[PDB]
Amino acid sequence: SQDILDLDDLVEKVDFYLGSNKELFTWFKNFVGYQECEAFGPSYKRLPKSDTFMPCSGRDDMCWEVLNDEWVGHPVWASEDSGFIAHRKNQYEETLFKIEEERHEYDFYIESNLRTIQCLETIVNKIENMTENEKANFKLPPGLGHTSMTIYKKVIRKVYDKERGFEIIDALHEHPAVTAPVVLKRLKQKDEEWRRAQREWNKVWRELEQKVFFKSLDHLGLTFKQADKKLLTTKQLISEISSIKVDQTNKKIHWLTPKPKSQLDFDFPDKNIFYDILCLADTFITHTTAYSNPDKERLKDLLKYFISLFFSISFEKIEESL
């Protein structure tokens, strides 16, 4: 009424206020006279034209046309400077992740070393089949002619010493004739020793995976026992039926004049399950010791009599089925 709120947002607010009252919110919807942009969203803000002008050398006119450089978003802005909630994982899932981490460590190191062995043995079988008069000035480019320029550097810097790895790399670049076979031999020895250790570790990883994996994939079942202790009580079972009745009585005054004469509905399509529960109960009666034998047998015919009397099952069928 102060010429501040727009009609669209007023209609939206009344829709959030009187949505379930369909008759009233229509009176207003029209009593008012509403007939059915710039939606930026919460997670984007617009930079000025000063911050947009940053050199991207590879951009042509189409790239400058189709790429957005003014509207940006960040996880820190969307978090409201609070943070994020990681998904909670079981301890079996955590140790599965640790097994995978160790597996990745071993396989990454072994395969990097194997790729370097393949490149070095290509260099070695190239250098073996030539004489020594030009073997002195034979050099190797960075990357050793391979598509990577850093993988062999990583392998050398790991296998040899930290300070000596750089000078071994430089000696391989300058004089590969002497440095290549010894480096290849040391890498092959490290490869076979790492692979033997990896097999011995693979046994342990496989047995823990067999011990851990199905518990790790179980989410609700890992906490089902305490949940069943907490929620299969008298208070929760009263709460369920009372909540359904409260829902029915709350929605009775709005619509559905034939109010239902029931809250919970139970379906019993199979009758053998009654005999299965009776057998389980009989097994518990036979096993238990805190109940006296007369109390045990009274429990037995009480359960059998209630099942035979509540449902359509006869006592003869119960006796012949159990």
Partner 1 sequence: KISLQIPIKLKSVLVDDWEYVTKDKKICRLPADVTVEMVLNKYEHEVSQELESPGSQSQLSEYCAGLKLYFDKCLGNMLLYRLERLQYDELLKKSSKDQKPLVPIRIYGAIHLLRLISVLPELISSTTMDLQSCQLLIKQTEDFLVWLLMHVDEYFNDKDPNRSDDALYVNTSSQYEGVALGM
Partner 2 sequence: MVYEATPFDPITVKPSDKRRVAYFYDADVGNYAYGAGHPMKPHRIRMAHSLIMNYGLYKKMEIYRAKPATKQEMCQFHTDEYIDFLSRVTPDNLEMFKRESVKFNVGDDCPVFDGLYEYCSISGGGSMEGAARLNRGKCDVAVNYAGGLHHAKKSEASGFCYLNDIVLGIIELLRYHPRVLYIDIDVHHGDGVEEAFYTTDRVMTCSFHKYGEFFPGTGELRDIGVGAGKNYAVNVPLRDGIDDATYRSVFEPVIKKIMEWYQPSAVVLQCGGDSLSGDRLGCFNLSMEGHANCVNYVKSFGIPMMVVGGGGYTMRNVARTWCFETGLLNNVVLDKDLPYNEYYEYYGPDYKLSVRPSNMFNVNTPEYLDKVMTNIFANLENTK
Partner 3 sequence: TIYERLLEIKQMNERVTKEINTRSTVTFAKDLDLLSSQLSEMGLDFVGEDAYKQVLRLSRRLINGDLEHQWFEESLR
Binding site for partner 1 (CB under 8 A): 38, 40, 45-49, 51, 72, 74, 76-77, 81
236 three-class SS: helix
Segment near partner 3 (CB under 8 A); pick from 67-75, 147-155, 169-177, 275-283: 275-283
- In sequence order, the 6+-apart residues with CB closer than 8 A to the CB of 311 are 268, 271, 274
Q: Are 187 and 116 in contact (CB under 8 A)?
A: yes
From partner 2, partner 3, partner 1, none, which one binds at residue 311 (CB under 5 to 8 Å depending on kind)? none
Segment near partner 3 (CB under 8 A); pick from 115-123, 128-136, 273-281, 295-303: 273-281
Q: Cα separations (Å) of 120 from 123, 160, 173, 195?
A: 5, 16, 12, 19
Residues 279-308 that bind partner 3 (CB under 8 A): 279-280, 283-284, 286-287
Q: Return the residue matching tokens 């359904």.
A: 244
Give one word for 265, left, alpha or beta, with left for phi > 0 and alpha for psi -120 to 50.
beta
Residue closer to partner 2 (CB basis): 151 or 278: 151
Residues at the contact surface with partner 2, assessed by CB under 8 A:
37-44, 54-59, 62-63, 65-75, 77-79, 83-87, 89, 93, 96-97, 100-101, 103-105, 107-108, 111-112, 115, 147-151, 153-154, 202, 205-206, 209-210, 213, 216-221
Residue closer to partner 2 (CB basis): 96 or 180: 96
Closest approach, Cβ 29 to partner 2, in A, equals 18
4: tokens are: 């501040």
Member of 38, 80, 270, 320 binding partner 3 (CB under 8 A)? 270
Residues in the chain: 322
Residue 94 to residue 101: CA distance in whole angstroms: 10
